[PDB]
Design a protein around this ligand. Structure first.
Ligand SMILES: Nc1ncnc2c1ncn2[C@@H]1O[C@H](COP(=O)(O)OP(=O)(O)NP(=O)(O)O)[C@@H](O)[C@H]1O
Ligand SMILES: C[C@@H](O)[C@H](N)C(=O)O
Length: 329
C-alpha cells in the first residue's frame, strides 16, 4: 500500500493524480472526506468495487454510496430525479447529505447490491473532490475500516485497518464531522431518513417538511446512560463490581477522577464530541477494561447522529432508569 500525505485544504494536485491513476486502473484508494474516510474504487467498475468488499471483509449485500464531484456525474449514475430534489441538491452539495435515487444502467450490481436504487453524495472535502475530478469517474466508497471496527476518522485508523489490503491510503488528516453522512431516501414520498448524520433533522424538515423519521462498535461491552440524572450513581454501582472506562464530556472529568476516562470533548460543542466519537470507541478496545459507560447527549442537531451511533455501538444497552442496570449487567 502506498501511503500518500496530502494537505487536506490545499491538496497538491500532482499527488492527487497518483491516486486518481489507481482509481482509473481499477484499484482501491482510501481517502478523507468531511464525514469519515472512505475506501473507493471506480463506481462504473464492478470488479474494482468488489475489491472494496474484499478489503473490508464486508457482506456483499450491503450497498455502497457513490461520490460525485459535479452535476454532470449525478446524471451518469441516477435518473428520474424530482425537480425539487435537484434544486435542493444544488444548494446542499458538496455536503454530508446522501440521497437515495433511482439508478441508471451504468451503476453495477456490485455497487447497488442488486437494488434498483443508488445512494449518491458530493463530498465537501478538497481531497475527495479533486480525487474524483482527476479520476474522471464517480467513486463508490463506504467507510474505510475493517468490517466490525468503528468508521475511521484519521489516517492512522485506516492504516491500522487496511495497510496491505488496499492500493493507496491518502493521509489527509482528521475528518471534519467524524460521523457518516445523513442518508435520505427520495424515491419514496414522503421522503424517509435512513441514517442521521451531520446534515440535521432540523434542516431536513425545513427542506422536506414531510420527511418521515424512523456493526461498527467496540468489542468491549458498552452501556449508554441516556439519563444524566443517574450517571454518577450508575458509575458508582458498576465501578464497584467492574473495571470501567467512562466516555464523557470534559466537564465531568473532575467528578470522576480515579476512574479510566475517555474524554469525548466539550458539552458546549457537540461537533467536538461527534468528531471524537469513533476514535473513543477504538480507545475503549485498546484499554483493558470490563466495560465502557458512555453518558448521553442532547439530540439537538448532530446530537441526534451521536446518539444514533452510540445506541448501535452499545448493542442497544441503554440505561434510562437506575434499575436498568439489572438488564445489561
Ligand atoms: N440504494 C440504497 N438504499 C437504501 N440504503 C442505501 C442504499 N445505498 C446505500 N445505502 C445505505 O448506505 C449505507 C452505506 O453507507 P456508507 O457510508 O457508504 O458505507 P458504510 O461503511 O456502510 N457506512 P457505515 O456503516 O456508517 O460505515 C448502506 O449500509 C445503506 O444503509
Ligand atoms: C466515505 C464517506 O463519504 C461515507 N461514504 C459517508 O457517506 O459518510
Amino acid at each position: 500500500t502506498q501511503i500518500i500525505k496530502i494537505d487536506p485544504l490545499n491538496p497538491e494536485i500532482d499527488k492527487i493524480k497518483i491516486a486518481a491513476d489507481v482509481i482509473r486502473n481499477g484499484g482501491t484508494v482510501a481517502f478523507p472526506t468531511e464525514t469519515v474516510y472512505g475506501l473507493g474504487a471506480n463506481a462504473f467498475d464492478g470488479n474494482a468495487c468488489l475489491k472494496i468488499f474484499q478489503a473490508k471483509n464486508r457482506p456483499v449485500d450491503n450497498p455502497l454510496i457513490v461520490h460525485i464531484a459535479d452535476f454532470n456525474q449525478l446524471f451518469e449514475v441516477a435518473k428520474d430525479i424530482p425537480d425539487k430534489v435537484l434544486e435542493i441538491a444544488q444548494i446542499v452539495w458538496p455536503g454530508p447529505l446522501t440521497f437515495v435515487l433511482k439508478k441508471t444502467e451504468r451503476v453495477p450490481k456490485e455497487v447497488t447490491a442488486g437494488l434498483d436504487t443508488v445512494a449518491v453524495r458530493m463530498p465537501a472535502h478538497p481531497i475527495a473532490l479533486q480525487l474524483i475530478r482527476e479520476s474522471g469517474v464517480p467513486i463508490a466508497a463506504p467507510s474505510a475500516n475493517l468490517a466490525t471496527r468503528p468508521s475511521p476518522t484519521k489516517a492512522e485508523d485506516v492504516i491500522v485497518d487496511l495497510n496491505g489490503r488496499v492500493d493507496v491510503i491518502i493521509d489527509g488528516g482528521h475528518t471534519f464531522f467524524g460521523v457518516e453522512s445523513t442518508i435520505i431516501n427520495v424515491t419514496v414520498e414522503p421522503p424517509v431518513l435512513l441514517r442521521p448524520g451531520p446534515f440535521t433533522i432540523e434542516e431536513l424538515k425545513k427542506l422536506f417538511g414531510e420527511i418521515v423519521i424512523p456493526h461498527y462498535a467496540p468489542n468491549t461491552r458498552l452501556l449508554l446512560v441516556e439519563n444524566r440524572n443517574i450517571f454518577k450513581d450508575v458509575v458508582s454501582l458498576l465501578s464497584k463490581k467492574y473495571k470501567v472506562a467512562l466516555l464523557i464530556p470534559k466537564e465531568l472529568s473532575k467528578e470522576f477522577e480515579g476512574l479510566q476516562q475517555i474524554i469525548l470533548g466539550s458539552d458546549e460543542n457537540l461537533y467536538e464530541v461527534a468528531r471524537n466519537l469513533f476514535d473513543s470507541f477504538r480507545e475503549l478496545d485498546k484499554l483493558n477494561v470490563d466495560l465502557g459507560i458512555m453518558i448521553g447527549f442532547p439530540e439537538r442537531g448532530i446530537g441526534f447522529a451521536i446518539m444514533n451511533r452510540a445506541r448501535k455501538a452499545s448493542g442497544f444497552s441503554i440505561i434510562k432508569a437506575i434499575s436498568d442496570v439489572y438488564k445489561y449487567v
